[PDB]
Design a binder for this molecule. Structure first.
Ligand code: HEM
Ligand code: HEM
Ligand SMILES: CC(C)CCC[C@@H](C)[C@H]1CC[C@H]2[C@@H]3C(=O)C=C4C[C@@H](O)CC[C@]4(C)[C@H]3CC[C@]12C
Ligand SMILES: CC(C)CCC[C@@H](C)[C@H]1CC[C@H]2[C@@H]3C(=O)C=C4C[C@@H](O)CC[C@]4(C)[C@H]3CC[C@]12C
Lengths: 479, 467
């Protein structure tokens, strides 16, 4: 059994399978980490996910781990997690199944030119999905009540699925069927994801296991080749699977399920929280409505449920500081990411207050929700302030302080440094696009107090609400 | 990682913290083990509770692990579990903090003469609690009712009574009860190796319980069980435990005496009232025994040891209740690498591996117990109305067919006392109250899979009125 040696952080006893475990027995991961801070100070070690994880919780020390460092491996743990949760052989190029640099693939196809086409495609897809079936106005005249999470889930999943994996236009009559099946199968697989990253076998979850494998079946190359308007990301990944890997057909299908998960698992809860917080807070709703109305006015874009679609420029979509602030403030409150790297050798990590001996293969982790909810940095941290990331000029605020010192890293739901989401710009675009179309197509009302976060997914990104909340919507801008 | 070697059972990949985990993600421990049985056959290995656990699921092979064997250590895992969950240094005499043989201590003080005085004391304590204060219906949750009655009675029987301040004892009892609920709630997690400081309320509850069981506080009490009196003595003369650790050893015994008894009592009561035929048979049996014993009920019943034991209808109701609700893990640890020879196969076992039975698989086997999910109150009654002991698997008569208390060396030392206390409770319920449900049968809560008698996922309400 492991014993603390001199210079190593305080070592907590106990085995924690995963961060969101045991909520039914009264666990609370945020409060658990905060209790460890009070007990041990800003650095402490836990046995978590079968590793020894050093938590660095001083915001002033984040820069020392988020920089590139000779002793940091920022891919090892993620590679192992993917192989384990999705079921494929090692994608670590050291293990010889592939020579692809996947970071390079993502950056090339989610940023730059590729981001522009993705963004246009998402906007077309969102409009096809959110617009009512071309029929009488009486069909869409009344208020409709639905769970908001459930609504966001189906719109964003379908739009995101078709944007990333293209569309099958050979059989249009059955695509509602296939999408609903894919949607249901993804819900069932993602449900058990916290357990899978803990090392629990997917065999323990029969329906989830079946769902994962049916999803993989739909993403076999033979099936993707039937589709049109496929993202450059998946086109390239198909090509690099074929030319740079020795993966079998199923494993190639699994690599696309990985990307499906990556594109959906955070975006869906992010969209929910942004919509909810916007509707819940009258000032936010008012500010967002005016910003979007003005942008569409200035861009000469008419809103209609049928006919001409909205086409915004890349600058018009990016220069939406009120929507940006609403999204950032929604993620500040809901984000529960683990930012990780693995010690390449024994070394001493030099931080703000102290220096700490780290062993080879130990994990050095940040849990930035601790910073996001820190009242020293964000006064009234549990309050949604739609303008929290707006300065006096109504532009995006970038000045935040801890102990009077200006923070470089103050907002981290996408990570930072090398450990950062390559899809972040596309994510912000798709949420903005969703919000724009919601404000433009619908009148919107709640029926609802703010649900707590579901911490069973602690470490996996944006936390969903513990329970859905009902809202009502009604189409506007009819003929 | 571990690789399955030649001759070893099929090895399931993955890591299972504890058997009742991940229910919120759709896990089902019983169906998981059954699925593995279909997939792999009667023997398979899982990484469970940080060990490599070989499940032996053939009822015809149980006898080969329930015998004393050169390679079976049947104490190591339990010792390690107690230290972890309750917080004390090793009680393994090999580790040098005690020379007590705790198994001997329990047998000496829970069986024989000691059993007779425990049983007499439990009846007095139950009657003290259940009697009317010195004509309305009361509606209550049945589990909640069984909990408070059996906890109080069992606590006072095992740990005695503080008679110096009678005026505050209901307050002290209610605090102990609340604290025990909060501690026991997280028990499944603790046996997985999760730290108790992950559960602030439960941690505080465990230590407040320990505080009340310090020797200084036990010495204030009277009519203490011989079990706790001897345990106190052996703490002092045979161990080098500190005061807190000595208190924790008594908390261990409090848990042992309560955590299975309470759910057992709920199920026996619930199944008896729910099933008219069972209620009629139990009522007639108790009536006849009390009449033949010259015992009249009123606002002290003194049954002989023979009179309490010879209650086959009540015995059958309790057995059939535990057959349905029991989720025990019967465990031993391999002392060395060896080949285990079972009915159909031989399997290589590594030193420090666990060899496990999960008897719920047998209890709910339709080959052994036809219509296994139906409560049949007379399932353990033969044609003569005596306790039935003849059960078959593939036509072969089973030695081990009813295992909620374990079997062999790995058997609950309090089992006889346990059956007495549930019988006494049922006797008093039938004798003192009119009883009505307000209720379809709750499913079992499998979060406690491995820990004994599973409670219902939800309580059910019932009414009771003093006769
Ligand atoms: C609100 C939406 C999203 C949030 C909060 C989010 C958050 C994250 C976080 C925290 C990581 C891990 C960063 C690290 O510590 O290394 C990550 C990785 C990743 N994300 Fe996102 N993400 C979002 C949307 C998307 C979208 C729409 C895509 C579309 C393809 C995407 C693709 C990825 C990929 C491919 C990785 C792994 C990169 C690698 O391992 O090289 N994400 N995301
Ligand atoms: C329905 C009631 C009860 C059930 C179902 C039950 C069940 C069990 C089971 C399955 C074991 C583990 C046996 C093994 O596999 O090694 C056990 C151990 C034990 N039980 Fe019980 N029990 C019950 C009542 C009691 C009561 C009332 C006491 C009172 C003191 C008690 C004291 C113990 C002790 C001390 C051990 C550990 C023995 C040792 O480690 O040497 N039990 N029980
Ligand atoms: C098969 C290959 C072509 C692709 C492999 C890419 C794998 C390694 C990438 C793709 C998406 C990535 C996850 C992600 O999107 C978000 C988070 C949130 C953060 O809090 C914890 C890490 C986590 C779960 C990432 C883990 C690594 C993943 C699975
Ligand atoms: C401190 C010492 C004086 C006493 C130590 C005794 C410890 C080792 C004894 C006392 C009570 C025993 C538990 C028990 O009652 C019932 C079960 C159910 C079974 O399904 C799994 C094992 C389990 C949890 C036993 C584990 C070992 C325990 C804690």
């Amino acid at each position: 059994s492991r014993r603390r040696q001199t210079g190593e952080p305080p070592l907590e006893n106990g085995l924690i399978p995963y961060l969101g475990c045991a909520l039914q027995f009264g666990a609370n991961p945020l409060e658990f980490l905060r209790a460890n801070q009070r007990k041990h100070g800003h650095v402490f070690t836990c046995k978590l996910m079968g590793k020894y994880v050093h938590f660095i919780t001083n915001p002033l020390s984040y820069h020392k781990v988020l920089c590139h460092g000779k002793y940091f491996d920022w891919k090892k743990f993620h590679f192992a997690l993917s192989a384990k949760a999705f079921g494929h052989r090692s994608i670590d190029p050291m293990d010889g199944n592939t020579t692809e640099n996947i970071n390079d693939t993502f950056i090339k196809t989610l940023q730059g030119h590729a981001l522009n086409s993705l963004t246009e495609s998402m906007m077309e897809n969102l409009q096809r999905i959110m617009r009512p079936p071309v029929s009488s106005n009486s069909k869409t005249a009344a208020w409709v009540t639905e769970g908001m999470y459930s609504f966001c889930y189906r719109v964003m999943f379908e739009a995101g699925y078709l944007t990333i994996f293209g569309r099958d236009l050979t059989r249009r009559d059955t695509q509602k069927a296939h999408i609903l099946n894919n949607l249901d199968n993804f819900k069932q697989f993602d449900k058990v994801f916290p357990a899978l990253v803990a090392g629990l076998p997917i065999h323990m979850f029969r329906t989830a296991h079946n769902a994962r494998e049916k999803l993989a079946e739909s993403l076999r190359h033979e099936n993707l080749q039937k589709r049109e308007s496929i993202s450059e990301l998946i086109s390239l990944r198909m090509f690099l699977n074929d030319t740079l890997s020795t993966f079998d057909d199923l494993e190639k299908a699994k690599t696309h399920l990985v990307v499906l998960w990556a594109s959906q698992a955070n975006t869906i809860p992010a969209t929910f929280w942004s919509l909810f917080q916007m509707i819940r807070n009258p000032e936010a709703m008012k500010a967002a409505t005016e910003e979007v109305k003005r942008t569409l006015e200035n861009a000469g874009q008419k809103v209609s449920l049928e006919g001409n679609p909205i086409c915004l420029s890349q600058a018009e979509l990016n220069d939406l500081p009120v929507l940006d602030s609403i999204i950032k403030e929604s993620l500040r409150l809901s984000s529960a990411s683990l930012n990780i790297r693995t010690a390449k050798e024994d070394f001493t990590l030099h931080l703000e207050d102290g220096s700490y001996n780290i062993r080879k293969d130990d994990i050095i982790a940040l849990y930035p929700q601790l910073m996001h909810l820190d009242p020293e940095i964000y006064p009234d941290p549990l309050t949604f302030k739609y303008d929290r990331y707006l300065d006096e000029n109504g532009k995006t605020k970038t000045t935040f302080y801890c102990n009077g010192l200006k923070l470089k890293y103050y907002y981290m739901p996408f990570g930072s440094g090398a450990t950062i989401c390559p899809g972040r710009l596309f994510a912000i675009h798709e949420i903005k696009q969703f919000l724009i179309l919601m404000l433009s197509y619908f009148e919107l009302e709640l029926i609802a107090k703010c649900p707590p976060l579901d911490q069973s997914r602690a470490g996996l990104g944006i936390l969903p609400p513990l329970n859905d909340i009902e809202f009502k919507y009604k189409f506007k801008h009819h003929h």
